[PDB]
Scaffold this motif. Structure first.
Motif: not given
Lengths: 93, 93
Positions: A20, A22, A33, A71-73, A75, A84-86, B1, B3-7
């Motif tokens: 993943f 972020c 993370w 899960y959290r990212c 910053a 953050e992003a989850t 800020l 924040v992003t979680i990408s795949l």
């Protein structure tokens, strides 16, 4: 322009592995993370996080039913302010 | 800020459905999705795209083996300059 495609939730099969990415757009000082139990993930042999500049990669190897969860990212800019992003991990089978 | 979680790549099972969120950080004027055959996706009954401000949501319903492939999100600022992100869809079973 910064473009990203992100998912709400990802499904994994036991034994599978996925990474993943972020990204913190801003002048982020740190990106960490947090696993579904609240704890900053420390790279192991099986769950690695490698910071690649303005991005951080969490790779979950050989997934098991216990990896499930949110899960959290997270910053952090240099004046200690966060964002953050989850993403939600499900494990099937 | 931001924040992003990408795949990189997502695996889907035939019959399943999933949505992907694309985000353009900047002053993006347009954001479009391109299916694995090169064509801007037009909402149907089964594959919908709903623009939610600075974000665009592509939802693939009732996935089939033919939905496989690379999808592009493509952002466009007002001086016609573009930028993009690509996610890879696999369909199993």
């Amino acid at each position: 322009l910064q473009v990203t495609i992100s998912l709400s939730k990802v499904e994994l099969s036991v034994g599978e592995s996925k990474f993943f990415t972020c990204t913190a757009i801003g002048e982020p000082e740190s990106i960490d993370w947090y696993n579904p139990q609240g704890e900053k993930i420390i790279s192991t042999q099986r769950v690695v996080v490698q910071k690649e500049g303005v991005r951080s990669r969490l790779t979950i190897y050989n997934a098991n039913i216990e990896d499930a969860g949110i899960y959290r990212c997270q910053a952090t800019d240099a004046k200690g302010q966060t964002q953050e992003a989850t993403v939600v991990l499900e494990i099937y089978q």
